[PDB]
Every structure is written in C-alpha cells, then in structure tokens.
Design an enzyme around this catalytic site. Structure first.
Site, short mmCIF file in Angstrom:
data_model
loop_
_atom_site.label_atom_id
_atom_site.label_comp_id
_atom_site.label_asym_id
_atom_site.label_seq_id
_atom_site.Cartn_x
_atom_site.Cartn_y
_atom_site.Cartn_z
N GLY A 44 34.24 40.54 41.89
CA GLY A 44 34.29 38.92 42.19
C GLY A 44 33.72 38.61 43.19
O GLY A 44 34.07 38.86 43.82
N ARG A 45 33.88 36.99 42.95
CA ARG A 45 33.82 36.30 43.89
C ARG A 45 35.08 35.22 44.06
O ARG A 45 35.24 34.15 43.71
CB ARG A 45 32.44 35.36 44.84
CG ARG A 45 32.56 35.15 45.74
CD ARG A 45 30.89 33.74 45.43
NE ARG A 45 29.71 34.87 45.81
CZ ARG A 45 28.48 34.93 45.84
NH1 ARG A 45 28.75 33.68 45.03
NH2 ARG A 45 27.86 36.02 46.65
N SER A 49 36.70 35.61 49.76
CA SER A 49 36.08 36.35 50.11
C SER A 49 35.46 37.18 48.64
O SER A 49 35.13 36.68 47.73
CB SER A 49 37.91 37.70 49.44
OG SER A 49 37.94 37.50 48.80
N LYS A 66 37.40 44.47 49.90
CA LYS A 66 37.35 42.91 50.04
C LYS A 66 37.15 42.63 50.88
O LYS A 66 37.43 42.17 52.29
CB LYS A 66 39.12 42.53 49.66
CG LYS A 66 39.17 40.87 49.96
CD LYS A 66 40.77 40.98 49.62
CE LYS A 66 41.22 39.29 50.07
NZ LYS A 66 42.67 38.76 49.79
N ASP A 154 50.56 31.98 46.36
CA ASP A 154 49.32 31.60 45.73
C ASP A 154 49.95 32.20 44.30
O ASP A 154 49.21 33.32 44.74
CB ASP A 154 47.96 31.81 45.87
CG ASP A 154 46.39 31.62 45.13
OD1 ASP A 154 47.13 30.15 44.37
OD2 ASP A 154 45.98 32.18 45.51
#
Ligand SMILES: COc1cc(/C=C/C=O)ccc1O
EC number: 2.7.11.1
Length: 328
Positions: A44-45, A49, A66, A154
């Site tokens: 993933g993006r 990162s 990462k 988060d």
C-alpha cells in the site's frame, strides 16, 4: 483564553523520564544493513509512506518494510523514537530494524510481519465474543503506550492489524504519535475524520491520551451496530454535527463552556438543536447479537464530549463488558 487541561492519568511520566526518552530531536538512529531485506510486493501507499512485504535474507523470514516519504527529520525521528520506546510492549508492532533506502533516500522501517486478515472479512464476521476479545487486546496496547507517555492519535480500523487465525493483534502506524507533556498544545489536524475527537473538531489543542479513547469508542460503535464508520461526516464540520445528533447539543455547549471554547461561527446555521439519544435506538435485528447492556454502557462511557470524562484505558479494562473474555 481557553481553560487549561491535564490528563487525569500518566500526567508526569515524561517529566520524570530521562530527557533522552522524549527528546526525539536529539535521537541518533542506529542503521542496519539495507541489503538484508529484499522487497517482494507493494502492500500500500499512504500519505506518508509506502509499505512492502519483504524477506529478511539473513533468516528467510517475512517482514514488512515501511519506506517513509520525505517529511521533516523530526517527524521521522519522532516515529522512530516512539517505536523504540514502546518495543516489546503488549500488542505494539515491533520495529526490527531501520535502514537507509538508496532509491528514496529516506529511512525504511522494518517491522515484524503480521499475517493480517483483511479488514472487510474481519468486520463482517467478528462475533460478539471476538469483538470483546480484540477490544481488550487494543486496550492493552493503549494502556501501555499511555503509561509510557505516548498518545497514538490515529486509532482507526486500518491501524489495527489482526491475524485472526492466531488471534493476534498489533497496533501499527505510529507516524502521528506524540509524547504527552502537561500543558502542551498539539496540532488538531490528527486522526482520520470519522475518528476525530470533539476536542479536535472544536480546535481545543491541550488534549491528551483520552483522544485515543474517543477513537476507540467510534470503532466499538461501528462494530457492535454494524455501521462503518459510525459518525459519517462529509467534512470536519459536518463530523461534529453528526456527533451532536447523537450526544445532543446541550452537552456540546456544556463541554465548550467548561473550557471557555467558542464554536466556529459557521456552525450557527448547520448545528441546530438535538436531544441526547439513547444507544438502544441503533439496535436492530441485524446487529442485536453484538449488543448487550454491558456493551452499551461501555460505549456510553467512551463516547463523552469531555475528554476528561472518558474512561481511561486501564478503567476500560475493568469494565463488565470484558468479564466473559477469557483472561490468559
Ligand atoms: C503504515 O504503517 C505501518 C504499516 C505496517 C504494516 C502494514 C501491513 O500491511 C506496520 C507498521 C506501520 O507503521
């Protein structure tokens, strides 16, 4: 001006730690060997990162790499220092290594691999028991990091990696995490919209660990009521209106009056007047097997406007909701 606020727990943990513990700007990174890791596939993006599955060719074990996007050295050092401080803690993702990526010219963080069950399969199949079990596991991680003077900022489903086969959970992406210092004012542009606490949405900067407990409550509500996300705002203003339609406007005004906060005047013609609702309103035949009196009381005690009124992670672990969960 706004009335000041203090965490009701772990208030002075960083004060009495050595300076090196929280002074991440002075941290000296210890670099591993970049050639130890072979990237296998991109997972993933994110905003900050790119994440890869990789192999550590010194043990042929899977890891996660990462690769950080260019951001301030201090946000980078902040995440690294926090990960090193929390390493080995319950359900905290383990930072295994840090290397210099020669292409990106930025640090690549190397983590333990978690064979996560993807999140949509998870939320549509987790049982009442599963939800209680995994909530308890998240609370272990949060009490640990709070007790270590750190707020995550988060908390959301995508940052809770679960290998359902081994009933294993890891709290990830500490890129927004901060050290809690009493009296410090923080950026309110943290957390995903749906998980933002009322303190963020009314621009109250002197917040603390209790932010994570609001986010946790939002996750809990989405799981037991099968509505994801639970508070589904179209922007940060509508997000507060969505919350106010449930918790009511009079307690919102009590909250901002307590801290001598003023709402953005743009709320004047969108907020309206709303009674506080009883949680039973959200129960129906398709979610009732996930709902209990204990679940609703626990939820009720997480989702408070007043950050000082929310259950702490430790108090949450004492709640009757977790009595049926087998303790190891
Ligand atoms: C995005 O941030 C992270 C992702 C993962 C693993 C992701 C697996 O898909 C581990 C640690 C992190 O900080």
């Amino acid at each position: 001006g706004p009335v000041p606020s203090r965490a009701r727990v772990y208030t002075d943990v960083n004060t009495h730690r050595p300076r090196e513990y929280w002074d991440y700007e002075s941290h000296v990174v210890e670099w591993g060997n970049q050639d130890d890791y072979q990237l296998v596939r991109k997972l993933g993006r994110g905003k900050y990162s790119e994440v890869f599955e990789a192999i550590n060719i010194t043990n042929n074990e899977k890891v996660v790499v990462k690769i950080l996007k260019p951001v301030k050295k201090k946000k980078i050092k902040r995440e690294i220092k926090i990960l090193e401080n929390l390493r080995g803690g319950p359900n905290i993702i383990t930072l295994a290594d840090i290397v210099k990526d020669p292409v990106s010219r930025t640090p690549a963080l190397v983590f333990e691999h978690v064979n996560n069950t993807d999140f949509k399969q998870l939320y549509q199949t987790l049982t009442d028991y599963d939800i209680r079990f995994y909530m308890y596991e998240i609370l272990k991680a949060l009490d640990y990091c709070h007790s270590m003077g750190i707020m995550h900022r988060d908390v959301k489903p995508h940052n809770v990696m679960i290998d359902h086969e081994h009933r294993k959970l890891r709290l990830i992406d500490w890129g927004l995490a901060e050290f809690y210092h009493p009296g410090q004012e923080y950026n309110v542009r943290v957390a995903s919209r749906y998980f933002k606490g009322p303190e963020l949405l009314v621009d109250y900067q002197m917040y603390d660990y209790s932010l994570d407990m609001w986010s946790l409550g939002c996750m809990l509500a989405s799981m037991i009521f099968r509505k994801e996300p639970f508070f589904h705002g179209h922007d940060n203003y509508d997000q507060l209106v969505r919350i106010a339609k449930v918790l009511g406007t009079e307690d919102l005004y009590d909250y901002i009056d307590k801290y001598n906060i003023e709402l953005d005047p743009r709320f004047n013609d969108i907020l309206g007047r709303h009674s506080r609702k009883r949680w039973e309103r959200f129960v129906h035949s398709e979610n009732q097997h996930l709902v209990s009196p204990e679940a609703l009381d626990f939820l009720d005690k997480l989702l408070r406007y007043d950050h000082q009124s929310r259950l702490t992670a430790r108090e949450a672990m004492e709640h009757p909701y977790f009595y049926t969960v087998v303790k190891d």
